[PDB]
Design a protein around this ligand. Structure first.
Ligand SMILES: Cc1cc2nc3c(=O)[nH]c(=O)nc-3n(C[C@H](O)[C@H](O)[C@H](O)COP(=O)(O)OP(=O)(O)OC[C@H]3O[C@@H](n4cnc5c(N)ncnc54)[C@H](O)[C@@H]3O)c2cc1C
Ligand SMILES: [Au+]
Length: 584
């Protein structure tokens, strides 16, 4: 109440056409059917499916002065109950439900994972919405279609290359299983065509979706001029201001290059790798982030001579034991590491020649800490250091939207310091930079803006997985972080090394695959961390995220019967602790 009433007023006004409803109520039917008949796009909320739905009933009477539902609004103007909507003509209602002020209800800057999702979901609940997306090309020249980082230049192409890499070992395994296989060379270009086919079908599918939902896809660069107007600047060079009630920033990030001679003019990044014409050849990856080690990982298994140059430690921010095991493995099966090193120069000794099939060579220099010098020669330098949020150049200075470390600061409804400017997915200072989280952020905001719902998105207990040659999934805290957060005295860690059955016949190292649970003994042996290293870590791990949201404890895993034979059953049977010292 009081504070709550005003929160609902604010949603009603900033919505479009909006019907408060109930399942078992007859009249709400009538109104909605009429709105469908006149192509009037709206967005309902069934108070019956809420359980704080009572508050709403009473809150709405504060606002409108009417007792029952249905209760209709046209962008903040109360239109009335059922008998009120019917007294307005077939022509003049359609007119009334379009009175706008602004060109759009929502303009979305960026058509990535989050933008696209926010966009489709808001149009479903009646908003007139514009989606800006423009891919500023890479220093090298590269560009892609609609869909964002994941679709074009991340998750999708990344996991496909990985699968190509995983098959390499699967074929070596198949001889143990009785198959006579020789297997031949790997043609890089044939892979990249079928990858780039799939990305093109997704480019198309997303463009199609926006079109079928009445989202105006504008292929142009957005920039804020003030809280209700953005400046669009298109492929040609044109300019064109458009107005809007709500602005959503959703511009993602881009690869960071370090500040050294040759970085931009001779290196490449993830943006370029997935669309490369030729074999990358003898390749060097600079950085120990997830992008670097995944890329390194699948290039090596594809045949390439990979070297990874690490500044200090691997996967800063992930559990350092597990990072250890990721690197160790990667290293056992071919990836050469150079550590600690940062590169200092990139210089071009030779040219690439399509006339007539033969790769460029670059001399890279580095300081080997103490330091001896580093100097070696590669065909590809791949910078996989970090990624920078896309917040310079969008006019954030004009509205003074607050930032930190470059990320747009936001509250728990994804809103900035200026109350009609929201930000979602990677640019925000909420959460891990992941696609499903960009998506859900946006799906839920759509429902708050244009159905007046209170559903917020939960940024705790987020699962993640790194697709290294052997995969690492994790939820919750690292061991170090749980330790330092809850105290050494209050955490027990359960662990076990094990072997998938699928590896016993092919004689691949035993006790490499590994599982640990982090336990906060003080809070009823709550699971506060989950870590798995092995094949299909992503699958193994997804389901335990739900159990964690429901507050799983150790006894909750042990009462669960396992599935056999599976890698994931090991979590139902864990006994050895780290404090015991017993071998795992
Ligand atoms: C190599 C790699 C692998 C990854 N793998 C995974 C994975 O396996 N799983 C996972 O969950 N996540 C993964 N991620 C993260 C995931 O890709 C991102 O979390 C997700 O793409 C973010 O979506 P977004 O909508 O916030 O940003 P983006 O998808 O990047 O959306 C931003 C879009 O806006 C455009 N844009 C920027 N500025 C403007 C402007 N001013 N006007 C108009 N348009 C603009 C950009 O060109 C881009 O198309 C990976 C990322 C990388 C780099
Ligand atoms: Au396993």
């Amino acid at each position: 109440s009081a504070e709550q009433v005003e929160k609902l007023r604010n949603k009603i006004n900033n919505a479009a056409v909006l019907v408060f409803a109930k399942s078992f109520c007859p009249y709400c039917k009538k109104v909605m059917e009429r709105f469908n008949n006149l192509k009037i796009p709206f967005g309902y909320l069934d108070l019956d499916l809420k359980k704080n739905g009572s508050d709403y009933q009473k809150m709405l009477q504060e606002i409108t002065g009417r007792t029952t539902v249905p209760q209709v609004f046209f962008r903040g103007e109360f239109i009335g109950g059922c008998d009120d909507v019917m007294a307005i003509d077939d022509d003049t209602i359609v007119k009334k439900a379009n009175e706008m002020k602004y060109d759009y209800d929502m303009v979305i800057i960026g058509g990535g994972s989050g933008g696209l999702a926010l966009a489709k979901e808001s149009a479903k609940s009646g908003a007139k919405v514009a989606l800006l997306d423009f891919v500023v090309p890479t220093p090298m020249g590269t560009t892609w279609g609609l869909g964002g980082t994941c679709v074009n230049v991340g998750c999708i192409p990344k996991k496909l290359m990985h699968q190509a890499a995983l098959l390499n070992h699967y074929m070596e395994d198949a001889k143990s299983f009785g198959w006579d296989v020789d297997k031949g060379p790997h043609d890089w270009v044939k892979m990249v065509e079928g990858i780039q086919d799939h990305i093109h079908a997704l480019n198309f599918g997303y463009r199609s979706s926006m079109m079928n939902a009445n989202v105006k896809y504008l292929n142009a660069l957005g920039e804020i001029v003030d809280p209700h107007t953005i400046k669009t600047t298109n492929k040609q060079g044109i300019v064109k201001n458009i107005t809007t009630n709500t602005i959503i920033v959703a511009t993602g990030e881009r690869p960071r290059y370090p500040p050294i001679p040759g970085a931009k003019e001779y290196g490449i990044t993830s943006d370029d790798l997935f669309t490369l014409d030729h074999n990358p050849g003898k390749t060097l990856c600079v950085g120990a982030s997830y992008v670097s080690l995944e890329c390194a990982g699948f290039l090596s298994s594809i045949g390439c001579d990979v070297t990874v140059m690490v500044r200090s430690i691997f996967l800063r921010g992930f559990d350092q034991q597990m990072a250890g095991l990721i690197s160790d493995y990667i290293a056992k099966y071919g990836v050469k590491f150079v550590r600690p090193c940062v590169p200092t120069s990139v210089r071009c000794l030779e040219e690439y020649d399509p006339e007539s099939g033969k790769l460029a060579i670059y001399e890279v220099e580095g300081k080997h800490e103490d330091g001896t010098p580093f100097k070696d020669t590669f065909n590809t330098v791949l910078f996989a250091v970090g990624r920078d949020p896309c917040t310079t150049n969008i006019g954030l200075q004009n509205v003074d939207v607050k930032t930190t470390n470059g990320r747009v600061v936001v509250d728990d409804e994804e809103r900035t310091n200026v109350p009609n400017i929201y930000a979602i997915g990677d640019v925000s200072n909420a959460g891990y930079q992941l696609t499903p989280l960009a998506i859900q952020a946006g799906k839920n905001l759509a429902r708050r803006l244009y159905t007046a719902d209170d559903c917020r998105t939960d940024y705790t207990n987020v699962p993640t997985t790194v697709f290294t040659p052997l995969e690492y999934g994790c939820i919750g805290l690292s061991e170090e972080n749980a330790i330092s957060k809850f105290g050494e005295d209050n955490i027990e860690v359960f662990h076990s090394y094990f072997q998938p059955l699928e590896w016993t016949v092919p004689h691949r190292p035993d006790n490499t695959c590994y599982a640990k649970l982090i336990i906060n003994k003080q809070d009823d042996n709550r699971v506060v961390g989950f870590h798995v290293f092995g094949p299909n870590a992503g699958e193994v791990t997804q389901g335990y995220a739900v159990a964690m949201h429901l507050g799983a404890r150790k006894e909750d895993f042990d009462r669960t019967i396992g599935i056999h034979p599976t890698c994931s059953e090991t979590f139902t049977t864990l006994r050895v602790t780290k404090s015991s010292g017993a071998s795992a």
